Amino acid sequence: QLEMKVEELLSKVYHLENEVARLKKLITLMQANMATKDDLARMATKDDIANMATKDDIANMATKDDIAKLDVKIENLNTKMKQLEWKVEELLSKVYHLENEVARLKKLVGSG
Amino acid sequence: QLEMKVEELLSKVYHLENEVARLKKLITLMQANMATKDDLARMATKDDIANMATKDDIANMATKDDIAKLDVKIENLNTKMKQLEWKVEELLSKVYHLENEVARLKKLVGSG
Amino acid sequence: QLEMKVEELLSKVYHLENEVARLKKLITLMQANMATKDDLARMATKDDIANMATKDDIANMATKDDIAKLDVKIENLNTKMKQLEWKVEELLSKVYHLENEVARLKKLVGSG
């Protein structure tokens, strides 16, 4: 009777020893595979990327090279404009002298 | 006496059985709720976003459509410039012929 | 004999009590340090940043201020162009009247 209880206890303690050993095995496997709070500290949050620009946001982005190409076109038009200005100035001068010459001729010819 | 110790052991083993059972329950709950190393492998790090562009970085971005609109303005100025060039050429020609006509008249009139 | 087994069981149960206590300590430390599924839900994934624009992507970005500066250059060329147009118009008029005056003089002078 007492002896039965002791036998029962021997069996139950051996089974507990094994249950404890298996829990240790499991906890070990868990620790090797667990992400930690430190791990989380190295990670980007959703909030960290809430103001992220995407490749689609910039798909139509102009570049500094686009600006430089336009600036070249503008400088070349400025040079052409100056060249025309100079020719107009030469002509303005020639027209003024022609007007003077014609005035003199009209004085000299009168009614003919 | 022996019997007391056996009773003590019976109680202590039943309590251990329950403690072990509760630990199993807890470990189960932990495994269902644990983030894993594989989970971490799918996540973005802080380092991964260190060179991220933001929506504020691009708030003043020019576009390809801004460049196209300027280019249209530049092409239209080029056409206007050519039109003026052509009219200046016509005038240069007319001034040259007037100069010739006036020269001939001055020869024919002399001092009047 | 029975007494030996009981002594053995007493020792083994005390050691189990301590093993269980140490497992509880460990599990506690694990729970305090574990990242959770909720934690993972707050984190950015690699997939979330797959379309991220970088600071290098925008290193050559033109700005709205670059566009405004070109537009000023273009407006100023437009004004210069108009000014030249007006002077050409004045000259066209003067050339037309000179042509008329010279025609009249040629009629009046004839062969001289």
Residue numbers in the entry:
A (entry chain A), B (entry chain A), C (entry chain A): 3 to 114
List passages from the publication reporting this PDB structure.
α-Helical coiled coils are ubiquitous protein domains, found in a wide range of structural and functional contexts. The structure of coiled coils is understood at a level unrivaled by any other fold. They consist of at least two α-helices, wound into superhelical bundles and held together by a mostly hydrophobic core. The seven positions in a heptad are labeled a – g, where positions a and d are oriented towards the core of the bundle and are thus mostly hydrophobic. β-Layers are found, also repetitively, in natural coiled coils, where they form regular fibers with alternating α- and β-structure, a protein fold that has not been described so far.
Crystallization trials yielded crystals in space group P63, diffracting to a resolution of 1.6Å, with one chain in the asymmetric unit and the trimer built by crystallographic symmetry around the c axis. It shows the anticipated α/β coiled coil with four consecutive β-layers. These layers are formed by the residues MAT of the repeats; the other residues, corresponding to KDDIAN, constitute positions e,f,g,a,b,c of the segments between the β-layers. Therefore, in accordance with heptad notation, the repeats can be written as IANMATKDD, with the isoleucine forming classical hydrophobic a layers and the MAT forming β-layers in place of position d. Only the first β-layer is part of a 6-residue element (hexad) and occurs after a position g of the preceding heptad.
